[PDB]
């Protein structure tokens, strides 16, 4: 995609789109950058993630609104409104699944296989778990189980690498554990696994904070607060 | 229950 | 557009899209509803306006961000960044002009010519002035003057009708005067005309408030506050 | 200077 635009121009315009809060444009620019075939820098990986996180975030929010309306329409004492709510929820759902498939396609072709460093490989595998998790949020058919296992497998590989290759305060390691814990709680019906992972992650990060500079300390403690927020909600 | 926001670079 | 969908289903899905804050979808649904060829009810006119106001509002906000960056890049002591900022601002600008042209096309084919009642005719002519005003905000060529005159002409016809056919507290009459005053201040370089229109509009509405129910009173005083806010900023 | 917001029906 965007095959006639220079890679550097795509990256520059992705940054401009973020400033203009044009996240669909941002995602299209970063998709074009990925398809140039070169590996992505730390900054460029962040741009890719931010763009699609915003796009799919809007779709998930819309899907939840429409799914809530649909479920109210299918209640005892309901006045038939027609197929419109279901049809429109299906439209948004199909568009969401398309975005997730696009991201998963980028990771599979060929971001993950060329990612050899821990920071890049864990980053992409965390993304893979995330976008399978988003697919799981809307899945109801004969593949909801397979989608959930695909998310778990990606998260698990990322966790194994991060525990071997990263310090316990590494922001990517912390964010991976945070999202994997959300997967356990919200998707896999394993709230005890979710709580245990968040607690162990928080405690081991705390014990490693003494090694950090003032700036890295702020990076890690911010994500630790998110783990604490979830623990407060779950316990 | 919140995942990493990750909407701002 | 949306030619195979029932008019009623388009209206229903437009309301769903607004609830999901999917304003591009909302605009597409209402565009399809308009092209069914039937006149629009008071509620349906509001849905049309809300949808495109949100869509073009996002584009205008993005265009202002990018135009600001572009102007900084073209300053004394600037480090050339390439054509990217201009190219992307032009992209957003072209998309904005397309949306404005689409709305103006709907008004011209054939909403305005079939609008005979004051409430509908003033509503559409106010929209026509608004979307020419949005075109004027980005115009720089040999038609910036013609676009400005097109906005003024639409606003002026709407004002003439509203002064003849509506009470001074009518929310559409008040909102028309508010936006026409913004046109005078921001587009036509006539701040004194802007201030005079806002003051006269506010004062004549105030003198008519005694005629209103509690609910109509709240409707009118809300827009009167917007006139007051602008006067506070301009004087 | 603000026009009618008109983003909510
Ligand atoms: Cl639909
Ligand atoms: Cl561009």
Mapped onto helix, strand or coil, the DSSP state of residue A223 is helix
Q: How far apart are CA A212 and CA A215, in angstroms?
A: 8
Question: In chain C, which residues have their Cβ closer than 8 Å to the Cβ of A88?
Answer: 13, 16-17, 25
Inter-residue contact C162 to C118 (CB < 8 Å): yes
The answer to whether chain C touches chain A by having 3 or more C-beta pairs less than 8 angstroms apart is yes
Q: Angle at CA A152, nearest 5°, toward A149 and A154?
A: 110
Inter-residue contact A167 to A211 (CB < 8 Å): yes
Question: In chain D, which residues have their Cβ closer than 8 Å to the Cβ of C233?
Answer: 1
Please give the DSSP secondary-structure letter assigned to residue A2. Answer: -
CA atoms within 13 A on the CB side of C51: 31
Q: At what angle do helices A84-106 and A118-138 cross, to 10 degrees?
A: 160
Q: Is A49 exposed, middle or buried (0-12, 13-18, 19+ CB in 10 A)?
A: buried
Q: How far apart are CA A178 and CA A230, in angstroms?
A: 9
Q: Angle at CA C54, nearest 5°, toward C53 and C56?
A: 65
Resolution in Å equals: 1.8
Q: At what angle do helices A84-106 and C7-19 cross, to 10 degrees?
A: 60
Please judge whether C20 and A62 are an interchain contact, meaning their C-beta atoms are less than 8 angstroms apart: yes
Identify the CA nearest to A205 among candidates A174, A176, A172, A166: A174
Q: At what angle do helices A171-186 and A144-165 cross, to 10 degrees?
A: 150
Identify the CA nearest to C166 among candidates C216, C96, C95, C110: C216
Inter-residue contact A181 to A198 (CB < 8 Å): yes
Which residues crowd ion ligand 2, with CB under 5 Å? C 87-88, 91
**A27: its two tokens:** 């995602």
Inter-residue contact A134 to A56 (CB < 8 Å): yes
Residue C45 neighbours by CB under 8 Å, 6+ apart: C120, C123, C124
Question: In chain B, which residues have their Cβ closer than 8 Å to the Cβ of A60?
Answer: none
Inter-residue contact A58 to A28 (CB < 8 Å): no
Distance in Å, alpha carbon of D6 to nearest chain C alpha carbon: 6
Q: Say whether residue C62 is in contact with chain A using an 8 A CB cutoff.
A: yes
The answer to whether chain A touches chain B by having 3 or more C-beta pairs less than 8 angstroms apart is yes
End-to-end CA distance of chain A: 46
Q: How far apart are CA C148 and CA C146, in angstroms?
A: 5
Q: Is A213 exposed, middle or buried (0-12, 13-18, 19+ CB in 10 A)?
A: exposed
Inter-residue contact C107 to C127 (CB < 8 Å): yes
Please judge whether D2 and C130 are an interchain contact, meaning their C-beta atoms are less than 8 angstroms apart: no
Q: Say whether residue C94 is in contact with chain A using an 8 A CB cutoff.
A: no
Residue C73 neighbours by CB under 8 Å, 6+ apart: C81, C85
Identify the CA nearest to C14 among candidates A129, A207, D9: D9
Within 10 angstroms of residue C214's Cβ, the number of other Cβ atoms is 6
Inter-residue contact C84 to A7 (CB < 8 Å): no
* Closest Cα in chain D to C52: D7
Q: Give the method used.
A: X-ray
Query: Which runs of consecutive H residues, i.e. helices, occur in A21-41?
Result: 23-34
Inter-residue contact A181 to A197 (CB < 8 Å): yes
Domains of chain C: 7-234 (1.20.190.20)
End-to-end CA distance of chain C: 46
Inter-residue contact C198 to D1 (CB < 8 Å): no
Residue A180 neighbours by CB under 8 Å, 6+ apart: A129, A155, A158, A159, A197
Question: In chain D, which residues have their Cβ closer than 8 Å to the Cβ of C230?
Answer: 1-2
Inter-residue contact A2 to A29 (CB < 8 Å): yes
Q: How far apart are CA C12 and CA C17, in angstroms?
A: 9
* Cα C219 to chain centroid, rounded: 19
Inter-residue contact A67 to A89 (CB < 8 Å): yes
**C206: its two tokens:** 């105030």
Inter-residue contact C174 to C201 (CB < 8 Å): yes
Mapped onto helix, strand or coil, the DSSP state of residue C28 is helix
Q: What's the CA-to-centroid distance between C32 and ligand 1, angstroms?
A: 12
Q: How far apart are CA C107 and CA C110, in angstroms?
A: 6
Q: What's the CA-to-centroid distance between C28 and ligand 2, angstroms?
A: 24
Residue A7 neighbours by CB under 8 Å, 6+ apart: A33, A36, A38
User: Which of A54-88 are b and which e, b meaning 16 or more Cβ less than 10 Å from the residue's Cβ?
Assistant: bbbbbbbebbebbbebbeeeeeeeeeeeeebbbeb
Query: Which runs of consecutive H residues, i.e. helices, occur in chain C?
Result: 7-19, 23-34, 42-73, 84-106, 118-138, 144-165, 171-186, 191-206, 214-234
Q: How far apart are CA A5 and CA A14, in angstroms?
A: 12
Q: How far apart are CA C74 and CA C150, in angstroms?
A: 31
């Amino acid at each position: 995609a965007m095959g006639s635009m220079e890679r550097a121009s795509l990256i520059q315009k992705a940054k401009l789109a973020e400033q203009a809060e044009r996240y669909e444009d941002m995602a299209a620019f970063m998709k074009g950058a990925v398809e140039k075939g070169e590996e992505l820098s730390c900054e460029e990986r962040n741009l890719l993630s931010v763009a699609y996180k915003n796009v799919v975030g809007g779709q998930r929010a819309a899907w939840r609104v429409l799914s809530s309306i649909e479920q109210k329409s299918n209640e005892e004492g309901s006045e038939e409104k027609g197929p419109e709510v279901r049809e429109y929820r299906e439209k948004v759902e199909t568009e969401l699944q398309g975005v997730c498939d696009t991201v998963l396609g980028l990771l599979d072709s060929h971001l993950i296989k060329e990612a050899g460093d821990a920071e890049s490989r864990v980053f992409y595998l965390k993304m893979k778990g995330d976008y399978y998790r988003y697919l799981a949020e809307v899945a109801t058919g004969d593949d909801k189980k397979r989608i959930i296992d695909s998310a778990r497998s990606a998260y698990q590989e990322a966790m194994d690498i991060s525990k071997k290759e990263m310090p316990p305060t590494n922001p990517i390691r912390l964010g991976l554990a945070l999202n994997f814990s959300v997967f356990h709680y919200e998707i896999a019906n394993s709230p005890e696994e979710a709580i245990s992972l968040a607690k162990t992650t928080f405690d081991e990060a705390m014990a490693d904070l003494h090694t950090l500079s003032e700036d890295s300390y702020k990076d890690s403690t911010l994500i630790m607060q998110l783990l604490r927020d979830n623990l407060t909600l779950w316990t | 229950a919140g995942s990493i926001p990750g909407r701002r670079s």
